[PDB]
Amino acid sequence: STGSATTTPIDSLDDAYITPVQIGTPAQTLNLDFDTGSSDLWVFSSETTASEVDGQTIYTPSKSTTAKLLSGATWSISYGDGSSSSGDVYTDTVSVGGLTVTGQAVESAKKVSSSFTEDSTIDGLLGLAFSTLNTVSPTQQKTFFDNAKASLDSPVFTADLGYHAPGTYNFGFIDTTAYTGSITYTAVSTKQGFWEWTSTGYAVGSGTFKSTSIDGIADTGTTLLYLPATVVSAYWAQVSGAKSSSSVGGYVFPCSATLPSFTFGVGSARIVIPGDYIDFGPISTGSSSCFGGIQSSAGIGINIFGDVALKAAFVVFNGATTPTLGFASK
Numbered sequence: 661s662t663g664s665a666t667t668t669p670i671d672s673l674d675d676a677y678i679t680p681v682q683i684g685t686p687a688q689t690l691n692l693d694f695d696t697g698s699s700d701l702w703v704f705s706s707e708t709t710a711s712e713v714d715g716q717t718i719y720t721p722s723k724s725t726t727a728k729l730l731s732g733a734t735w736s737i738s739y740g741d742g743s744s745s746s747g748d749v750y751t752d753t754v755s756v757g758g759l760t761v762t763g764q765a766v767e768s769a770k771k772v773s774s775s776f777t778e779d780s781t782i783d784g785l786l787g788l789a790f791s792t793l794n795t796v797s798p799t800q801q802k803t804f805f806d807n808a809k810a811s812l813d814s815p816v817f818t819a820d821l822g823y824h825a826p827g828t829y830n831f832g833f834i835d836t837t838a839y840t841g842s843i844t845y846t847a848v849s850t851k852q853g854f855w856e857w858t859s860t861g862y863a864v865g866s867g868t869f870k871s872t873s874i875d876g877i878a879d880t881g882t883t884l885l886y887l888p889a890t891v892v893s894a895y896w897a898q899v900s901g902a903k904s905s906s907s908v909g910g911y912v913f914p915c916s917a918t919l920p921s922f923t924f925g926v927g928s929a930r931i932v933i934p935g936d937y938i939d940f941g942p943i944s945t946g947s948s949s950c951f952g953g954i955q956s957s958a959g960i961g962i963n964i965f966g967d968v969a970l971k972a973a974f975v976v977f978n979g980a981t982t983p984t985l986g987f988a989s990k
Contacts, residue, residue, distance in 0.1 A: 692785060697882055712776075717783045721752065730799075730801075733801075734748055737795045864895050865935075887963050917950075
Protein backbone atom coordinates (compact mmCIF):
# COMPACT_ATOMS: atom_id res chain seq x y z
CA SER A 661 0.00 0.00 0.00
CA THR A 662 0.85 3.68 -0.21
CA GLY A 663 -0.58 7.04 0.83
CA SER A 664 -0.11 10.60 -0.41
CA ALA A 665 -1.45 13.72 1.27
CA THR A 666 -0.98 17.42 0.69
CA THR A 667 0.43 19.47 3.56
CA THR A 668 -0.44 23.17 3.74
CA PRO A 669 1.20 26.05 5.65
CA ILE A 670 -1.02 27.39 8.42
CA ASP A 671 -0.15 31.03 7.70
CA SER A 672 1.85 33.31 5.42
CA LEU A 673 5.10 32.61 7.34
CA ASP A 674 5.02 28.79 7.17
CA ASP A 675 4.86 28.71 10.99
CA ALA A 676 3.66 25.10 10.69
CA TYR A 677 2.02 22.75 8.20
CA ILE A 678 -1.30 20.90 8.48
CA THR A 679 -2.29 17.69 6.72
CA PRO A 680 -5.84 16.32 6.61
CA VAL A 681 -6.35 13.02 8.44
CA GLN A 682 -9.47 10.85 8.47
CA ILE A 683 -10.35 9.38 11.87
CA GLY A 684 -13.23 7.05 12.63
CA THR A 685 -16.30 5.69 10.87
CA PRO A 686 -17.82 7.64 9.27
CA ALA A 687 -14.66 9.65 8.72
CA GLN A 688 -13.99 12.72 10.82
CA THR A 689 -11.38 14.82 9.04
CA LEU A 690 -8.99 16.76 11.27
CA ASN A 691 -6.02 18.87 10.17
CA LEU A 692 -2.97 17.59 12.05
CA ASP A 693 0.60 18.80 12.40
CA PHE A 694 2.82 15.94 11.20
CA ASP A 695 5.74 15.96 13.62
CA THR A 696 8.85 13.86 13.02
CA GLY A 697 10.11 15.08 16.43
CA SER A 698 7.42 13.36 18.52
CA SER A 699 5.50 10.10 18.64
CA ASP A 700 1.95 10.77 19.84
CA LEU A 701 -1.10 11.13 17.59
CA TRP A 702 -3.36 13.39 19.65
CA VAL A 703 -6.44 15.40 18.80
CA PHE A 704 -8.76 18.07 20.08
CA SER A 705 -11.91 16.19 20.98
CA SER A 706 -15.35 16.20 22.51
CA GLU A 707 -13.49 15.54 25.81
CA THR A 708 -11.32 18.67 25.63
CA THR A 709 -12.06 21.24 28.34
CA ALA A 710 -14.56 23.54 26.64
CA SER A 711 -12.74 26.78 27.48
CA GLU A 712 -9.58 25.37 25.84
CA VAL A 713 -11.25 24.87 22.45
CA ASP A 714 -11.38 27.93 20.18
CA GLY A 715 -12.18 27.12 16.56
CA GLN A 716 -10.48 23.72 16.20
CA THR A 717 -12.23 20.77 14.64
CA ILE A 718 -12.80 18.07 17.25
CA TYR A 719 -12.86 14.29 17.18
CA THR A 720 -15.99 12.85 18.80
CA PRO A 721 -15.33 9.18 19.51
CA SER A 722 -18.97 8.50 20.46
CA LYS A 723 -19.93 9.24 16.83
CA SER A 724 -17.43 6.71 15.46
CA THR A 725 -18.66 3.13 15.19
CA THR A 726 -15.07 1.86 15.12
CA ALA A 727 -13.81 3.80 18.18
CA LYS A 728 -12.95 1.80 21.28
CA LEU A 729 -11.81 3.24 24.59
CA LEU A 730 -8.35 1.91 25.43
CA SER A 731 -9.14 1.03 29.02
CA GLY A 732 -6.97 2.66 31.63
CA ALA A 733 -4.68 4.38 29.14
CA THR A 734 -3.65 8.00 29.59
CA TRP A 735 -1.10 10.28 27.95
CA SER A 736 0.65 13.52 28.75
CA ILE A 737 3.22 15.32 26.67
CA SER A 738 5.34 18.44 27.02
CA TYR A 739 7.07 19.86 23.97
CA GLY A 740 10.32 21.81 23.68
CA ASP A 741 8.56 25.15 23.19
CA GLY A 742 6.81 24.70 26.54
CA SER A 743 3.45 23.67 25.12
CA SER A 744 1.60 20.61 26.43
CA SER A 745 -1.49 18.43 26.28
CA SER A 746 -2.87 15.31 27.98
CA GLY A 747 -5.90 13.03 28.08
CA ASP A 748 -7.14 9.49 27.48
CA VAL A 749 -6.92 7.11 24.52
CA TYR A 750 -9.12 5.44 21.93
CA THR A 751 -8.24 3.06 19.15
CA ASP A 752 -9.86 3.81 15.81
CA THR A 753 -9.33 3.69 12.07
CA VAL A 754 -7.01 6.40 10.79
CA SER A 755 -6.33 7.17 7.14
CA VAL A 756 -3.80 9.54 5.60
CA GLY A 757 -3.91 10.19 1.88
CA GLY A 758 -5.59 6.87 1.16
CA LEU A 759 -3.42 4.77 3.50
CA THR A 760 -5.48 3.18 6.27
CA VAL A 761 -4.44 1.84 9.67
CA THR A 762 -6.98 0.05 11.83
CA GLY A 763 -6.53 0.01 15.60
CA GLN A 764 -4.45 3.19 15.69
CA ALA A 765 -4.09 4.81 19.11
CA VAL A 766 -5.86 8.18 18.91
CA GLU A 767 -5.01 10.21 21.97
CA SER A 768 -7.97 12.37 22.93
CA ALA A 769 -7.07 15.63 24.66
CA LYS A 770 -8.78 16.49 27.92
CA LYS A 771 -6.39 19.43 28.44
CA VAL A 772 -4.26 21.53 26.10
CA SER A 773 -1.96 24.46 26.85
CA SER A 774 -2.87 27.99 25.82
CA SER A 775 -0.64 27.97 22.74
CA PHE A 776 -2.72 25.15 21.24
CA THR A 777 -6.03 26.81 22.16
CA GLU A 778 -4.88 30.06 20.59
CA ASP A 779 -4.14 28.46 17.22
CA SER A 780 -7.41 27.53 15.54
CA THR A 781 -5.71 25.93 12.53
CA ILE A 782 -4.11 22.89 14.23
CA ASP A 783 -6.53 20.16 15.35
CA GLY A 784 -3.77 18.00 16.85
CA LEU A 785 -0.42 16.35 16.11
CA LEU A 786 0.56 13.18 14.26
CA GLY A 787 3.91 11.98 15.57
CA LEU A 788 6.40 10.38 13.19
CA ALA A 789 9.44 9.95 15.44
CA PHE A 790 10.20 6.50 16.91
CA SER A 791 7.54 4.80 18.99
CA THR A 792 9.90 4.60 21.97
CA LEU A 793 8.96 8.27 22.66
CA ASN A 794 5.21 7.62 22.76
CA THR A 795 3.77 8.83 26.07
CA VAL A 796 0.79 6.49 26.50
CA SER A 797 0.77 4.79 29.90
CA PRO A 798 0.75 2.05 31.09
CA THR A 799 1.03 0.47 27.64
CA GLN A 800 3.08 2.48 25.16
CA GLN A 801 1.48 2.80 21.71
CA LYS A 802 2.86 2.77 18.17
CA THR A 803 2.96 5.64 15.69
CA PHE A 804 0.85 5.69 12.54
CA PHE A 805 4.00 4.95 10.50
CA ASP A 806 5.02 2.07 12.77
CA ASN A 807 1.55 0.53 12.41
CA ALA A 808 1.48 1.04 8.64
CA LYS A 809 5.02 -0.01 7.86
CA ALA A 810 4.59 -3.71 7.19
CA SER A 811 1.76 -2.97 4.74
CA LEU A 812 3.70 -0.33 2.81
CA ASP A 813 5.29 -1.06 -0.55
CA SER A 814 8.54 0.25 0.96
CA PRO A 815 9.07 1.06 4.66
CA VAL A 816 9.51 4.80 4.12
CA PHE A 817 7.78 8.14 4.25
CA THR A 818 8.85 11.37 2.62
CA ALA A 819 8.45 15.03 3.52
CA ASP A 820 8.33 17.59 0.74
CA LEU A 821 7.45 20.86 2.45
CA GLY A 822 6.75 23.96 0.40
CA TYR A 823 8.05 27.49 0.85
CA HIS A 824 4.97 29.69 1.15
CA ALA A 825 3.13 26.89 -0.69
CA PRO A 826 1.63 23.45 -0.18
CA GLY A 827 3.77 20.32 -0.26
CA THR A 828 3.38 16.58 0.20
CA TYR A 829 3.77 13.71 2.67
CA ASN A 830 4.06 10.34 0.95
CA PHE A 831 3.98 6.93 2.65
CA GLY A 832 5.42 3.78 1.17
CA PHE A 833 7.08 5.12 -1.99
CA ILE A 834 9.61 7.63 -3.27
CA ASP A 835 8.26 9.98 -5.95
CA THR A 836 11.21 10.23 -8.32
CA THR A 837 9.60 13.25 -10.05
CA ALA A 838 9.64 15.29 -6.82
CA TYR A 839 13.37 16.06 -6.58
CA THR A 840 16.36 16.90 -8.74
CA GLY A 841 19.64 15.01 -8.92
CA SER A 842 20.12 12.12 -6.52
CA ILE A 843 19.08 11.38 -2.95
CA THR A 844 22.03 11.27 -0.53
CA TYR A 845 21.46 8.94 2.38
CA THR A 846 23.03 9.41 5.80
CA ALA A 847 23.15 7.41 9.04
CA VAL A 848 20.55 7.76 11.79
CA SER A 849 20.81 7.17 15.51
CA THR A 850 17.54 6.18 17.13
CA LYS A 851 19.00 6.24 20.65
CA GLN A 852 17.08 9.37 21.71
CA GLY A 853 13.98 8.34 19.74
CA PHE A 854 14.51 10.97 17.02
CA TRP A 855 15.58 10.98 13.39
CA GLU A 856 19.03 12.03 14.55
CA TRP A 857 21.82 12.45 12.01
CA THR A 858 25.09 14.31 11.52
CA SER A 859 25.46 17.09 8.99
CA THR A 860 28.90 17.42 7.43
CA GLY A 861 29.06 21.22 7.64
CA TYR A 862 27.79 24.54 6.39
CA ALA A 863 28.28 27.63 4.31
CA VAL A 864 26.91 31.16 4.57
CA GLY A 865 25.85 32.75 1.29
CA SER A 866 28.58 32.44 -1.33
CA GLY A 867 31.18 31.72 1.36
CA THR A 868 33.46 28.72 1.59
CA PHE A 869 32.09 25.48 3.02
CA LYS A 870 33.14 24.69 6.58
CA SER A 871 33.58 20.97 7.14
CA THR A 872 32.35 20.22 10.64
CA SER A 873 30.11 17.57 12.19
CA ILE A 874 26.75 18.90 13.38
CA ASP A 875 24.57 16.33 15.11
CA GLY A 876 20.87 17.16 15.02
CA ILE A 877 17.36 15.97 14.36
CA ALA A 878 15.17 16.16 11.28
CA ASP A 879 12.03 17.66 12.81
CA THR A 880 9.05 18.65 10.71
CA GLY A 881 7.26 19.82 13.87
CA THR A 882 9.75 22.59 14.63
CA THR A 883 9.47 25.76 12.53
CA LEU A 884 13.03 27.07 12.58
CA LEU A 885 16.61 25.88 12.14
CA TYR A 886 18.42 25.66 15.50
CA LEU A 887 22.20 25.28 15.29
CA PRO A 888 25.27 25.86 17.48
CA ALA A 889 25.93 29.44 18.53
CA THR A 890 29.17 29.59 16.54
CA VAL A 891 27.38 28.70 13.30
CA VAL A 892 24.46 31.03 13.94
CA SER A 893 26.76 33.95 14.78
CA ALA A 894 28.65 33.37 11.53
CA TYR A 895 25.35 33.53 9.60
CA TRP A 896 23.97 36.69 11.19
CA ALA A 897 27.33 38.48 10.98
CA GLN A 898 26.65 38.67 7.22
CA VAL A 899 23.47 40.67 7.76
CA SER A 900 23.93 44.38 8.49
CA GLY A 901 22.15 45.37 11.69
CA ALA A 902 21.36 41.82 12.81
CA LYS A 903 21.69 41.12 16.52
CA SER A 904 20.68 38.68 19.20
CA SER A 905 17.90 40.18 21.31
CA SER A 906 17.34 38.72 24.76
CA SER A 907 14.05 40.62 25.02
CA VAL A 908 12.68 39.21 21.76
CA GLY A 909 14.23 35.77 22.33
CA GLY A 910 16.64 35.37 19.45
CA TYR A 911 18.30 36.93 16.45
CA VAL A 912 16.44 39.75 14.76
CA PHE A 913 17.41 41.73 11.69
CA PRO A 914 16.24 44.81 9.75
CA CYS A 915 13.21 43.90 7.68
CA SER A 916 14.85 45.91 4.87
CA ALA A 917 17.65 43.32 4.58
CA THR A 918 18.18 40.85 1.79
CA LEU A 919 19.24 37.67 3.60
CA PRO A 920 22.07 35.39 2.42
CA SER A 921 21.46 31.71 1.79
CA PHE A 922 22.57 29.00 4.19
CA THR A 923 23.98 25.68 2.97
CA PHE A 924 24.14 22.48 5.02
CA GLY A 925 26.04 19.31 4.20
CA VAL A 926 24.58 15.84 3.80
CA GLY A 927 27.59 13.64 3.26
CA SER A 928 29.30 15.09 0.18
CA ALA A 929 26.03 16.68 -0.97
CA ARG A 930 24.80 20.20 -0.22
CA ILE A 931 21.34 21.56 0.48
CA VAL A 932 20.92 25.30 -0.08
CA ILE A 933 18.34 27.22 1.97
CA PRO A 934 17.54 30.46 0.08
CA GLY A 935 17.77 33.65 2.12
CA ASP A 936 14.05 34.34 1.81
CA TYR A 937 13.30 31.09 3.72
CA ILE A 938 15.06 32.60 6.75
CA ASP A 939 12.76 35.65 7.04
CA PHE A 940 9.99 35.21 9.64
CA GLY A 941 8.69 38.72 9.40
CA PRO A 942 8.08 41.55 11.85
CA ILE A 943 8.57 40.69 15.52
CA SER A 944 5.27 42.47 16.19
CA THR A 945 2.73 43.97 13.82
CA GLY A 946 4.13 47.06 12.09
CA SER A 947 7.68 46.60 13.38
CA SER A 948 10.69 47.03 11.09
CA SER A 949 12.60 44.45 13.14
CA CYS A 950 12.19 40.95 11.67
CA PHE A 951 12.66 37.57 13.34
CA GLY A 952 15.35 35.26 12.01
CA GLY A 953 14.75 31.71 10.85
CA ILE A 954 18.15 30.47 12.02
CA GLN A 955 18.55 30.56 15.79
CA SER A 956 20.91 29.22 18.42
CA SER A 957 20.34 25.77 19.90
CA ALA A 958 22.38 26.70 22.97
CA GLY A 959 20.19 25.81 25.93
CA ILE A 960 17.99 23.43 23.92
CA GLY A 961 20.55 20.65 24.25
CA ILE A 962 20.07 19.44 20.68
CA ASN A 963 20.40 20.91 17.18
CA ILE A 964 17.15 20.94 15.22
CA PHE A 965 16.81 20.81 11.44
CA GLY A 966 13.27 22.18 11.46
CA ASP A 967 11.05 23.32 8.62
CA VAL A 968 13.39 26.12 7.49
CA ALA A 969 15.96 23.46 6.57
CA LEU A 970 13.68 20.62 5.57
CA LYS A 971 11.57 22.71 3.17
CA ALA A 972 14.69 23.26 1.06
CA ALA A 973 14.89 19.48 0.42
CA PHE A 974 13.03 16.36 -0.50
CA VAL A 975 13.51 14.26 2.63
CA VAL A 976 13.27 10.48 2.94
CA PHE A 977 12.58 8.99 6.35
CA ASN A 978 13.71 5.42 5.75
CA GLY A 979 12.23 3.09 8.36
CA ALA A 980 14.05 -0.05 7.29
CA THR A 981 15.47 -2.30 10.02
CA THR A 982 18.42 0.10 10.20
CA PRO A 983 16.81 3.49 9.64
CA THR A 984 18.46 6.18 7.52
CA LEU A 985 17.64 9.67 6.20
CA GLY A 986 17.83 10.79 2.57
CA PHE A 987 18.08 14.37 1.28
CA ALA A 988 17.74 15.64 -2.27
CA SER A 989 17.58 19.10 -3.73
CA LYS A 990 14.32 19.98 -5.48
